Design a binder for this molecule. Structure first.
Ligand SMILES: *[C@@H]1O[C@H](CO)[C@@H](O[C@@H]2O[C@H](CO)[C@@H](O[C@@H]3O[C@H](CO)[C@@H](O)[C@H](O[C@@H]4O[C@H](CO)[C@@H](O)[C@H](O)[C@@H]4O)[C@@H]3O)[C@H](O)[C@H]2NC(C)=O)[C@H](O)[C@H]1NC(C)=O
Ligand SMILES: *[C@@H]1O[C@H](CO)[C@@H](O[C@@H]2O[C@H](CO)[C@@H](O[C@@H]3O[C@H](CO)[C@@H](O)[C@H](O[C@@H]4O[C@H](CO)[C@@H](O)[C@H](O)[C@@H]4O)[C@@H]3O)[C@H](O)[C@H]2NC(C)=O)[C@H](O)[C@H]1NC(C)=O
Ligand SMILES: *[C@@H]1O[C@H](CO)[C@@H](O[C@@H]2O[C@H](CO)[C@@H](O)[C@H](O)[C@H]2NC(C)=O)[C@H](O)[C@H]1NC(C)=O
Ligand SMILES: *[C@@H]1O[C@H](CO)[C@@H](O[C@@H]2O[C@H](CO)[C@@H](O)[C@H](O)[C@H]2NC(C)=O)[C@H](O)[C@H]1NC(C)=O
Ligand SMILES: CCCCCCCCO[C@@H]1[C@@H](O)[C@H](O)[C@@H](CO)O[C@H]1O
Ligand SMILES: CCCCCCCCO[C@@H]1[C@@H](O)[C@H](O)[C@@H](CO)O[C@H]1O
Ligand SMILES: CCCCCCCCO[C@@H]1[C@@H](O)[C@H](O)[C@@H](CO)O[C@H]1O
Ligand SMILES: CCCCCCCCO[C@@H]1[C@@H](O)[C@H](O)[C@@H](CO)O[C@H]1O
Ligand SMILES: CCCCCCCCO[C@@H]1[C@@H](O)[C@H](O)[C@H](CO)O[C@H]1O
Ligand SMILES: *C(=O)CCCCCCCCCCCCCCC
Ligand SMILES: *C(=O)CCCCCCCCCCCCCCC
Lengths: 326, 326
C-alpha cells in the first residue's frame, strides 16, 4: 500500500518508515522536496499576479464603458467573478499553505477552501456552457418568436449558481468529502478513495456524468450548430467579402473555445476515470497535481480567450488603463 | 556593527551570535526567513514567465515580418537581446540559487552571473539612450544633409556594447568587484563597501556620473527637443486633425518613456548616493533588494512600452501567434 490514511485525509505516501504526519499538523517535506513546495508557490503567485488584474480589469472596464453592458455580456461578467473566487478562495490560500509545507488551516479550513475553490471553477465552467446555449439560441434562432434579453441573461446566471452549488455543497454535508490533495497544500473533492461512509463512488460518477459529459455534449452541439448556420448562410452570400471573413473568424473562435474547454477538463476527467478503474495504485502527490494545474490555470486563459480577444472590450481596456483616452 | 566580512563578500548581518555563514557555503536563513526566499524565487519565476516570451516573441516576429526590419528598429532588437541576458544570466540563476538559500556557484560563479546580469541591464539602458539620440537626430534633423541608415543603426548597437563592457568588465579585473548582494542569492557590483584594494569609491562615482547622469541628461535633452519640434510643427498646421493627434500622441509616449526610465534607475542611484553618504549603517538584506526590484522588473516593462505599444509590431505579433493569419 502506497498511502497512509488519517481520519480526515489521505497522504499519498507510505508510513512504513513512520515519517508520515497529518497534512493538517506538520510539513510534508517527505513526499516532496521543500524546493518543490517553493515552486508550488511560484505557480500560485503567477496565477494571482495574472489572474487578479486580468479578471478585475474586466469588471472595472464594464463599469466604465456602457456598450459593454449587454445582457449577452452578463455571463462573461459572471465568469470573471468566478475566476476571482478561484484566486482569493484557492490560489492565495495555497500560496500561504505551500510556504508552510502543509494545510495550516485544518479540517474546517479544508472545507472552506475546498468549497469556494470548487464553487469558482464550477461557476466558471457552467458559465462557458450557458454562454454557448445563449449564443446558439440567438444565432440559430431555434424558437418561433423569441428575443433574448435581460431576464433571460439573469436566469442564465442563476442557473450557473445552482449547478455549482449542486456540485460543491454536497461534500460539506455527507456526499463525498473534501481533503488535502497532491502535496496536501490545497483541498479538493475526494475522487481517489473508496471512502464508503460518504459514497465517493456514486458522487464521482455523478460528477463525471452531470458536470463533465453533459457540459461537453451541450457545448459541442450548440457551437456545432452555430458554425453550421454561419457557414450555411455565408455560402449563400459569397459575393460579400466581409461575410466570408466573419464566417472564418467565428469558426476559428469556436475551435479555440472548444479546444480550450477540453484542455481544461479532459485531463481532470481522464485521471478520475482512470483511478475509478485503477483502485488506489500509488499516485505521486506530484502526479495528482496535473489534473489540477490544467484546470486552475484556466482562470487566466479563459478571460484572455472569451474577453481579451474582442476588439470591443479590448478598445475600452485601452481607454481605461490609459488615464481616460487613446 | 551590522555586517560581517569575509574575504570575498559582505553579509549584511552581525556575527555576534556566531551564526553567520559564507554566502558561498550555507543557507542564509538567519537574515531572511525561508518563505521570503521562496518569495524571491516566485518573483524570479514571474520575471522569467513574462520576460522570456515577451523578449523572444520580439525577435521571432521580426524574423517573420519584413516591415519590422528597418534600421531604426535595430536598437529595439538590441534591447530584447539585452533583456534576454538579464533573464538567463540573472533571473534563472537566481531562481536556482534562491531555492538553495545561498549562492551555490561560488566566487567565480558570482563573477560570471554578476557580469552577464550587469552586461544585460547596461546594454539595455544604453540602448534606450541611443534610441533617443536616433529619434532626435531624424526628427530634429540637427545636421546639414544627413540620412540615418544601416551603418549608423549599427554604430549605435556597437556603441551600447562598448559602454556596457566599460561598466561590467572593470569589476572583473580590479576596479570595484562583484559579490552577493541583499539576500546573498544574486551577485552585483559592490557599491556599499569602502573596499579599497579595489577603489570601490571612485568606481561608484564613475558609475553615478557616466552611467546615470549622462544617460539622464542625453535622454531629457533629446526627447525635450523632439517634443518641442513636434509641438512647433503642429502649431503651424492646426488645420489637420491627424497632426494634432500625432503630436498629442508623441508627447504621451515621451512622458511614459522618461517616467519609465526614472522608475528604473532613480531608485538604484538613490540608494547608491545615500550609502556613499551613509557609511555602513545597517541596510537589511531586504532594503538593498528594492533598488534591484525596480531595475530587474524592467526586462518586462521596457518591451511592453518600447515595442508592444506600437500598433505595427502588435499586428505582426497577432499574425505570427495566430498561425499565419488573422
Ligand atoms: C506514521 O507512523 C508513525 C509511527 O507509527 C506514527 O507516529 C507515532 O504516533 C504515535 C501515536 O499514535 C506516537 O505515540 C506516542 O509516543 C510518544 C513516546 O515516544 C509519546 O508522546 C506518547 O506516549 C504516550 O503513551 C501513553 C500510554 O500508551 C498514552 O496514553 C499517551 O497518550 C501517549 O501516547 C505516544 O504514545 C509515536 O510516538 C509516533 N511515532 C513517531 C515516529 O512519530 C504516525 O502517527 C503515523 N502517521 C499517521 C499519518 O498516522
Ligand atoms: C561567525 O562566527 C563563528 C564563530 O566565531 C565562526 O565559526 C567558527 O569558525 C572557526 C574557523 O575559523 C571554527 O574553528 C574550528 O573549530 C572546530 C571545532 O569546534 C574544528 O572544526 C576546528 O578545530 C581545529 O582548530 C585548530 C586551529 O586553531 C586546528 O586544530 C585546526 O585548524 C582545526 O580547525 C576549527 O578550530 C569554529 O568551529 C566555528 N564555530 C562556529 C560556531 O561555526 C564563523 O566563521 C563566523 N563567520 C564568519 C566570521 O565569516
Ligand atoms: C502500491 O504501489 C503499487 C504500484 O507501484 C501497487 O502494486 C500494484 O498492484 C496491483 C494489484 O492489484 C497490480 O495490478 C499492479 O501491477 C501493481 N503495481 C506494480 C508495482 O506492478 C499497489 O497496488 C499499491 N498499493 C495499494 C494497492 O494501495
Ligand atoms: C549598525 O547600526 C548602527 C545603528 O543602526 C549604526 O550606527 C548608526 O550611525 C549613525 C551615524 O553615524 C547614527 O546616527 C545612528 O545612531 C546609528 N543608526 C541609527 C539609525 O541609529 C552602525 O554604524 C551599524 N554598524 C556598522 C556596520 O557601522
Ligand atoms: C532534489 C535533489 C537536489 C537536486 C535537484 C535537481 C532537480 C531534480 O529534478 C527532479 C524533479 O523534476 C522531479 O519532479 C523529482 C521527483 O518528483 O525528482 C527530482 O530529482
Ligand atoms: C505571502 C506571505 C506568506 C507567509 C508565509 C509564512 C510561513 C511561515 O512558516 C513558518 C514555519 O514553516 C516555521 O517552521 C515556523 C517556525 O517555528 O514558523 C512559521 O511561521
Ligand atoms: C466542434 C464544434 C464546433 C467545431 C466545428 C469546426 C469545424 C471546422 O469546419 C471546417 C473549417 O474549419 C475549414 O475552414 C473549412 C475549410 O474547408 O472546412 C470546414 O468544414
Ligand atoms: C529547480 C531548482 C532546483 C533547486 C534544488 C534545491 C536543492 C537544495 O536541497 C537542500 C540540500 O542540498 C541540503 O543538503 C538540505 C539540508 O539538509 O536541504 C535541502 O533542501
Ligand atoms: C523577497 C523577500 C521579501 C518578501 C516581502 C517582505 C515582507 C516583509 O515582512 C517581513 C517581516 O515579517 C520580517 O520580520 C522582516 C521585517 O523587518 O522582514 C520582512 O520582509
Ligand atoms: C489566435 O486566435 C490563436 C491563438 C489565440 C488563443 C489564445 C491563446 C492565449 C492563451 C493564454 C493562456 C496563458 C495561461 C498561462 C499558461 C501557460
Ligand atoms: C496608456 O498607455 C497609459 C499607460 C501606459 C502603459 C505602460 C505600462 C506598461 C507596464 C507593463 C510592465 C509590467 C511590469 C510587471 C511587473 C513584474
Amino acid at each position: 500500500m502506497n498511502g497512509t490514511e488519517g481520519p480526515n485525509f489521505y497522504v499519498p505516501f507510505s508510513n512504513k518508515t513512520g515519517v508520515v504526519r497529518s497534512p493538517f499538523e506538520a510539513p510534508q517535506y517527505y513526499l516532496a522536496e521543500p524546493w518543490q513546495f517553493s515552486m508550488l508557490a511560484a505557480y500560485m503567485f503567477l496565477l494571482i499576479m495574472l489572474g487578479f488584474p486580468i479578471n478585475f480589469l474586466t469588471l472595472y472596464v464594464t463599469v466604465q464603458h456602457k456598450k459593454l453592458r449587454t445582457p449577452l455580456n452578463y455571463i462573461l461578467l459572471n465568469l470573471a467573478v468566478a475566476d476571482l473566487f478561484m484566486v482569493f478562495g484557492g490560489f492565495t490560500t495555497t500560496l500561504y499553505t505551500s510556504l508552510h509545507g502543509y494545510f495550516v488551516f485544518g479540517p474546517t479550513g479544508c472545507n472552506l477552501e475546498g468549497f469556494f475553490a470548487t464553487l469558482g471553477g464550477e461557476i466558471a465552467l457552467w458559465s462557458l456552457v450557458v454562454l454557448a446555449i445563449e449564443r446558439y439560441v440567438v444565432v440559430c434562432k431555434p424558437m418561433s418568436n423569441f428575443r433574448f434579453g435581460e431576464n433571460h441573461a439573469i436566469m442564465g446566471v442563476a442557473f450557473t449558481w445552482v449547478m455549482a452549488l449542486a456540485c460543491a455543497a454536497p461534500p460539506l454535508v455527507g456526499w463525498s468529502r473534501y481533503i488535502p490533495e497532491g502535496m496536501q497544500c490545497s483541498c479538493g473533492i475526494d475522487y481517489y478513495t473508496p471512502h464508503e461512509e460518504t459514497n465517493n463512488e456514486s458522487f464521482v460518477i455523478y460528477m463525471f456524468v452531470v458536470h463533465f459529459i453533459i457540459p461537453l455534449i451541450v457545448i459541442f452541439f450548440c457551437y456545432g450548430q452555430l458554425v453550421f448556420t454561419v457557414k450555411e448562410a455565408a455560402a449563400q452570400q459569397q459575393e460579400s467579402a466581409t461575410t466570408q471573413k466573419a464566417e472564418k473568424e467565428v469558426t476559428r473562435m469556436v475551435i479555440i473555445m472548444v479546444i480550450a474547454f477540453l484542455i481544461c477538463w479532459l485531463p481532470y476527467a481522464g485521471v478520475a476515470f482512470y483511478i475509478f478503474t485503477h483502485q488506489g495504485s500509488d499516485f505521486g502527490p506530484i502526479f495528482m497535481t496535473i489534473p489540477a494545474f490544467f484546470a486552475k490555470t484556466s482562470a487566466v486563459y479563459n478571460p484572455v480567450i472569451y474577453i481579451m480577444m474582442n476588439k470591443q472590450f479590448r478598445n475600452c481596456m485601452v481607454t481605461t488603463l490609459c488615464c481616460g483616452k487613446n
